[PDB]
Design an enzyme around this catalytic site. Structure first.
Site, PDB file in Angstrom:
ATOM      1  N   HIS A 125      -8.217   7.530   8.382  1.00  0.00           N
ATOM      2  CA  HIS A 125      -6.834   7.940   8.083  1.00  0.00           C
ATOM      3  C   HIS A 125      -6.630   8.247   6.598  1.00  0.00           C
ATOM      4  CE1 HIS A 125      -5.578   3.669   7.057  1.00  0.00           C
ATOM      5  NE2 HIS A 125      -4.731   4.303   6.249  1.00  0.00           N
ATOM      6  N   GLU A 131     -15.212   0.441 -11.219  1.00  0.00           N
ATOM      7  CA  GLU A 131     -13.848   0.348 -11.721  1.00  0.00           C
ATOM      8  C   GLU A 131     -13.363  -1.101 -11.689  1.00  0.00           C
ATOM      9  OE1 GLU A 131     -11.603   1.375 -13.711  1.00  0.00           O
ATOM     10  OE2 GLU A 131     -11.187   3.337 -12.801  1.00  0.00           O
ATOM     11  N   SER A 135      -6.417   0.368   2.245  1.00  0.00           N
ATOM     12  CA  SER A 135      -7.124   0.919   3.412  1.00  0.00           C
ATOM     13  C   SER A 135      -8.401   1.622   3.039  1.00  0.00           C
ATOM     14  CB  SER A 135      -6.242   1.897   4.167  1.00  0.00           C
ATOM     15  OG  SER A 135      -5.105   1.246   4.689  1.00  0.00           O
ATOM     16  N   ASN A 143     -10.063  -2.093 -14.145  1.00  0.00           N
ATOM     17  CA  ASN A 143      -8.679  -1.812 -14.489  1.00  0.00           C
ATOM     18  C   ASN A 143      -8.543  -0.294 -14.425  1.00  0.00           C
ATOM     19  OD1 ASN A 143      -6.255  -1.206 -16.021  1.00  0.00           O
ATOM     20  ND2 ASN A 143      -6.392  -3.207 -17.019  1.00  0.00           N
ATOM     21  N   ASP A 158     -10.943   3.941  13.122  1.00  0.00           N
ATOM     22  CA  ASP A 158     -10.583   4.250  11.754  1.00  0.00           C
ATOM     23  C   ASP A 158     -11.704   3.967  10.778  1.00  0.00           C
ATOM     24  OD1 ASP A 158      -8.864   5.210   9.802  1.00  0.00           O
ATOM     25  OD2 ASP A 158      -7.705   3.342   9.632  1.00  0.00           O
ATOM     26  N   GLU A 183     -17.458   2.780 -15.316  1.00  0.00           N
ATOM     27  CA  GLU A 183     -17.025   3.662 -14.242  1.00  0.00           C
ATOM     28  C   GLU A 183     -17.957   4.841 -14.013  1.00  0.00           C
ATOM     29  OE1 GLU A 183     -13.526   1.802 -16.442  1.00  0.00           O
ATOM     30  OE2 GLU A 183     -15.257   3.022 -17.044  1.00  0.00           O
ATOM     31  N   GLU A 187      -7.648   1.495 -17.977  1.00  0.00           N
ATOM     32  CA  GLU A 187      -8.413   1.222 -19.193  1.00  0.00           C
ATOM     33  C   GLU A 187      -9.868   1.641 -18.975  1.00  0.00           C
ATOM     34  OE1 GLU A 187      -7.961  -3.024 -19.724  1.00  0.00           O
ATOM     35  OE2 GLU A 187      -6.164  -2.805 -20.983  1.00  0.00           O
TER      36      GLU A 187
HETATM   37  C1  LIG Z   1      -3.835   9.550   3.292  1.00  0.00           C
HETATM   38  C2  LIG Z   1      -3.165   8.272   3.741  1.00  0.00           C
HETATM   39  C3  LIG Z   1      -2.304   8.256   4.831  1.00  0.00           C
HETATM   40  C4  LIG Z   1      -1.601   7.112   5.176  1.00  0.00           C
HETATM   41  C5  LIG Z   1      -1.741   5.933   4.442  1.00  0.00           C
HETATM   42  C6  LIG Z   1      -1.121   4.650   4.874  1.00  0.00           C
HETATM   43  N1  LIG Z   1       0.170   4.663   5.271  1.00  0.00           N
HETATM   44  C7  LIG Z   1       0.685   3.471   5.624  1.00  0.00           C
HETATM   45  N2  LIG Z   1       0.081   2.265   5.629  1.00  0.00           N
HETATM   46  C8  LIG Z   1      -1.204   2.284   5.219  1.00  0.00           C
HETATM   47  N3  LIG Z   1      -1.952   1.111   5.164  1.00  0.00           N
HETATM   48  C9  LIG Z   1      -1.815  -0.294   5.315  1.00  0.00           C
HETATM   49  C10 LIG Z   1      -0.639  -0.920   5.706  1.00  0.00           C
HETATM   50  C11 LIG Z   1      -0.588  -2.301   5.825  1.00  0.00           C
HETATM   51  C12 LIG Z   1      -1.711  -3.087   5.564  1.00  0.00           C
HETATM   52  C13 LIG Z   1      -1.677  -4.558   5.790  1.00  0.00           C
HETATM   53  N4  LIG Z   1      -0.526  -5.185   5.865  1.00  0.00           N
HETATM   54  N5  LIG Z   1      -2.792  -5.230   5.928  1.00  0.00           N
HETATM   55  C14 LIG Z   1      -2.883  -2.454   5.155  1.00  0.00           C
HETATM   56  C15 LIG Z   1      -2.935  -1.076   5.032  1.00  0.00           C
HETATM   57  C16 LIG Z   1      -1.853   3.462   4.827  1.00  0.00           C
HETATM   58  O1  LIG Z   1      -3.124   3.417   4.380  1.00  0.00           O
HETATM   59  C17 LIG Z   1      -2.614   5.957   3.352  1.00  0.00           C
HETATM   60  C18 LIG Z   1      -3.322   7.097   3.023  1.00  0.00           C
HETATM   61 NA    NA Z   2     -11.267   1.219 -15.918  1.00  0.00          NA
END
Ligand SMILES: Cc1ccc(-c2ncnc(Nc3ccc(C(=N)N)cc3)c2O)cc1
Ligand code: NA
Lengths: 233, 49
Positions: free
Chosen positions: A41, A54, A184, A56, A88, A64, A59
């Site tokens: 996703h 990476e 994610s 920070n 996913d 990196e 900085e």
């Molecule tokens: C290109 C792209 C499209 C959509 C998203 C995206 N939209 C919504 N929620 C996401 N993740 C997420 C939500 C909750 C938790 C948790 N509570 N463990 C962990 C991860 C997410 O990655 C990001 C990038």
């Molecule tokens: Na850095």
């Protein structure tokens, strides 16, 4: 990561951050010098850069390594129009190899059987530069958190959404600590006698760190043969 | 004696016992433990913590 801690430099040297129209939108893990494993996703067409070593994100630490993504392989069962978060997992090929060192090191991936045995140890580390509060801003310093595995029955009762058998639940009964949006694609790893193995991909969740909800992860055991095959050097 | 009980004492992988390690590691002299076979083996922290 909500309720986590600042990683020290080189503490999760397999972690990478993904940058696109927005920086740090997702994470990933180093499979080897040319390949990253992330969530499907997060990727699709859309130009992405990977930054290894990476710590920070605001900085220059001189550890990196930035690379362009030349190929994106979502798993063939991934289909966003049917389910945005099922199957996913995706692989990203880098334009030039990363140079392995103390800040840029691959994550181990055991066979299917042992990846599932290590997940069942019940305690993993998640990390990333995602949100540090629900609806807040992404982290500057890489964050990490130890999350306990949650049994499938408890996990099924927590949501109206469908949790498939090759997804797992991890987090705390009272919330407070969890992975979040921006994390994610990042790793869920298990330490086995001082060696970390990839046991999950950070996938999704409803909100972040809410009592009664858990983080949802992709079981890596389901995809080990596909990862080893596509990432052969 | 058997992989079912304490992984046959193998630090990483066991096969009915013959112990083994993941890529970048070799099986130590004791035939149970795993030690680096390359400079930066997978899953290890090498920076001072
Ligand atoms: C290109 C792209 C499209 C959509 C998203 C995206 N939209 C919504 N929620 C996401 N993740 C997420 C939500 C909750 C938790 C948790 N509570 N463990 C962990 C991860 C997410 O990655 C990001 C990038
Ligand atoms: Na850095």
């Amino acid at each position: 990561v909500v309720g986590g801690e600042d990683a020290k430099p080189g503490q999760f040297p397999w972690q990478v951050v993904l940058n696109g129209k927005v920086d740090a939108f997702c994470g990933g893990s180093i499979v080897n010098e040319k390949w990253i494993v992330t969530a499907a996703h997060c990727v699709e067409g859309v130009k992405i850069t990977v930054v290894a070593g990476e710590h920070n994100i605001e900085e220059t630490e001189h550890t990196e390594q930035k690379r362009n993504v030349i190929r994106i392989i979502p798993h063939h069962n991934y289909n966003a129009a049917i389910n945005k978060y099922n199957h996913d997992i995706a692989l990203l090929e880098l334009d030039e190899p990363l140079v392995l060192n103390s800040y840029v090191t691959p994550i181990c991936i055991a066979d299917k059987e042992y990846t599932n045995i290590f997940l069942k140890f019940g305690s993993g580390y998640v990390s990333g530069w995602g949100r540090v509060f629900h609806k807040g801003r992404s982290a500057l310093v890489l964050q990490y958190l130890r999350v306990p595995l949650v049994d499938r029955a408890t996990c099924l009762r927590s949501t109206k959404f469908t949790i498939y058998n090759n997804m797992f639940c991890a987090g705390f009964h009272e919330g407070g600590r969890d992975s979040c949006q921006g994390d994610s694609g990042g790793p869920h790893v298990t330490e086995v006698e001082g060696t970390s193995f990839l046991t999950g991909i950070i996938s999704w969740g409803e909100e972040c760190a809410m009592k009664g909800k858990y983080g949802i992860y992709t079981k890596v055991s389901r995809y080990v043969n596909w990862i080893k095959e596509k990432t052969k050097l | 004696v058997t992989c079912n009980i304490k992984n046959g004492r193998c630090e990483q992988f066991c096969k009915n016992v013959v112990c083994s390690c993941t890529e970048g590691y070799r099986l130590a002299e004791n035939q149970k433990s795993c030690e680096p076979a390359v400079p930066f083996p997978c899953g290890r922290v090498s920076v001072s913590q």
